[PDB]
Amino acid sequence: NATAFVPALVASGLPNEKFCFEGFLPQKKGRQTRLKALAEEHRTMVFYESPHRLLKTLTQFAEYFGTERQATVSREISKLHEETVRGSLAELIEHFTATEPRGEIVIVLAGIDD
């Protein structure tokens, strides 16, 4: 629905010859299952997340994928206004602990490195 992802995929600087599109992770049932499977993934990954849930998700991603994993966050703040935030998950969590995420979010996550 937030077909903002292709622009975010290209903009991330991350490998895009292949990728996995995840969408929203489920809230409860089957979440950890997805996370465990996604921990092994070598391909770039693409998620949607709600803004209120964003920081919990980036924190959990550091748990499962590692604090140095590279990612980007794209936020449609309005029709007139959008932003990209880049770096490791640790830098991303610092970033969004500061300011309240409002808007529609796409996360582009580097795959396993090796």
Side-chain angles (χ1 to χ4, degrees):
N1 210 44
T3 323
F5 74 93
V6 179
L9 218 214
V10 184
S12 65
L14 302 171
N16 69 203
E17 319 254 299
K18 327 142 103 66
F19 64 89
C20 295
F21 178 89
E22 182 69 35
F24 293 97
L25 285 149
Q27 308 281 241
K28 263 263 293 205
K29 33 230 72 190
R31 184 188 193 75
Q32 184 191 32
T33 288
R34 298 290 320 122
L35 292 155
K36 289 211 176 188
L38 296 165
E40 290 304 78
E41 184 50 72
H42 281 70
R43 277 156 307 179
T44 295
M45 288 146 292
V46 170
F47 315 80
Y48 294 156
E49 184 51 278
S50 109
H52 319 302
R53 252 168 278 112
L54 175 54
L55 216 218
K56 176 144 167 175
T57 288
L58 300 177
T59 304
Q60 208 163 21
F61 283 4
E63 226 172 280
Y64 283 80
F65 306 121
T67 61
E68 293 300 282
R69 192 70 70 90
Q70 281 291 315
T72 77
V73 176
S74 296
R75 288 178 49 213
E76 305 257 318
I77 297 169
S78 92
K79 172 66 178 326
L80 269 52
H81 182 203
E82 68 205 314
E83 70 170 21
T84 320
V85 182
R86 262 197 228 84
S88 60
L89 258 13
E91 293 163 318
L92 259 11
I93 293 159
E94 267 301 313
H95 181 95
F96 290 97
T97 295
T99 53
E100 281 329 29
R102 237 166 69 284
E104 303 196 11
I105 323 258
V106 171
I107 313 155
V108 178
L109 177 71
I112 272 273
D113 188 23
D114 65 294

XYZ file of all heavy atoms in Angstrom, residues 13 15 17 33 36-37 41 50 59 73 79 81-82 93 95 99-100 107 109:
148
model
N 21.266 2.486 -1.146
C 22.674 2.178 -1.441
C 22.970 0.691 -1.313
O 24.039 0.227 -1.691
N 22.519 -3.567 -1.847
C 22.322 -4.484 -2.992
C 20.828 -4.661 -3.305
O 20.005 -4.835 -2.392
C 22.924 -5.807 -2.503
C 23.894 -5.431 -1.379
C 23.602 -4.024 -0.940
N 19.910 -6.177 -6.664
C 19.764 -7.140 -7.750
C 18.802 -8.239 -7.286
O 18.087 -8.816 -8.094
C 21.109 -7.764 -8.137
C 22.278 -6.783 -8.180
C 22.716 -6.449 -9.595
O 23.131 -7.368 -10.348
O 22.652 -5.257 -9.968
N 9.461 -16.459 14.712
C 9.661 -17.367 13.607
C 10.190 -16.626 12.375
O 11.160 -17.078 11.743
C 8.348 -18.057 13.269
O 8.053 -18.996 14.299
C 8.408 -18.790 11.941
N 13.676 -15.298 13.143
C 14.719 -16.318 13.132
C 15.144 -16.677 11.708
O 16.339 -16.749 11.407
C 14.319 -17.564 13.934
C 14.300 -17.331 15.442
C 14.648 -18.593 16.238
C 14.699 -18.270 17.732
N 15.220 -19.349 18.661
N 14.157 -16.864 10.832
C 14.388 -17.129 9.412
C 15.113 -15.961 8.734
O 16.015 -16.181 7.896
C 13.066 -17.420 8.712
N 19.173 -14.560 6.401
C 18.964 -14.079 5.043
C 20.146 -13.254 4.525
O 20.591 -12.305 5.184
C 17.680 -13.253 5.009
C 17.300 -12.774 3.666
C 17.315 -13.882 2.709
O 16.398 -14.717 2.803
O 18.257 -13.953 1.890
N 4.684 0.537 11.341
C 3.941 1.683 11.850
C 4.896 2.578 12.637
O 5.896 2.098 13.203
C 2.818 1.252 12.745
O 3.164 1.615 14.059
N 15.042 -1.923 17.570
C 15.740 -2.490 18.731
C 15.785 -4.012 18.621
O 16.836 -4.634 18.703
C 15.043 -2.037 20.014
O 14.997 -0.605 20.009
C 15.777 -2.525 21.257
N 15.730 4.101 6.804
C 14.306 4.325 7.181
C 13.820 5.463 6.331
O 14.457 6.537 6.281
C 14.137 4.699 8.710
C 12.707 5.021 9.047
C 14.690 3.589 9.649
N 2.248 14.369 2.387
C 2.331 14.294 0.940
C 3.436 15.224 0.404
O 4.061 14.941 -0.619
C 0.960 14.655 0.342
C 0.942 14.812 -1.167
C 1.229 13.485 -1.909
C 1.156 13.688 -3.433
N 0.115 14.696 -3.789
N 6.166 16.100 2.178
C 7.383 16.036 2.954
C 7.835 14.612 3.267
O 7.059 13.807 3.797
C 7.196 16.862 4.231
C 8.401 16.912 5.113
N 8.321 17.186 6.461
C 9.715 16.709 4.852
C 9.530 17.152 6.993
N 10.395 16.867 6.037
N 9.095 14.302 2.950
C 9.665 12.983 3.276
C 11.176 12.996 3.613
O 11.918 13.891 3.211
C 9.360 11.984 2.161
C 10.088 12.302 0.857
C 9.378 11.756 -0.372
O 8.961 10.574 -0.351
O 9.237 12.514 -1.356
N 18.588 3.462 15.947
C 17.938 3.459 17.269
C 18.259 4.747 18.046
O 17.354 5.340 18.661
C 18.389 2.219 18.067
C 17.861 0.918 17.432
C 18.091 2.342 19.553
C 18.693 -0.339 17.865
N 18.834 7.492 16.644
C 18.135 8.549 15.935
C 16.674 8.619 16.346
O 16.155 9.693 16.565
C 18.220 8.361 14.423
C 17.540 9.449 13.668
N 18.214 10.548 13.180
C 16.234 9.643 13.374
C 17.352 11.366 12.613
N 16.144 10.839 12.717
N 13.666 11.720 18.310
C 12.405 12.251 17.744
C 11.291 11.199 17.576
O 11.575 10.057 17.184
C 12.659 12.891 16.344
O 13.327 11.944 15.501
C 13.497 14.185 16.445
N 10.041 11.597 17.839
C 8.847 10.755 17.587
C 8.526 10.433 16.119
O 8.269 11.343 15.316
C 7.602 11.343 18.256
C 7.548 11.059 19.736
C 8.207 9.726 20.088
O 9.149 9.316 19.354
O 7.790 9.099 21.102
N 11.515 0.379 5.968
C 12.861 0.009 6.392
C 13.477 -0.919 5.303
O 12.838 -1.866 4.838
C 12.861 -0.712 7.775
C 11.986 0.018 8.806
C 14.291 -0.924 8.339
C 11.469 -0.936 9.941
N 16.780 -3.200 4.906
C 17.769 -3.811 5.788
C 18.809 -4.652 5.022
O 18.446 -5.564 4.276
C 17.027 -4.648 6.856
C 17.873 -5.456 7.868
C 18.587 -4.575 8.874
C 16.984 -6.480 8.574
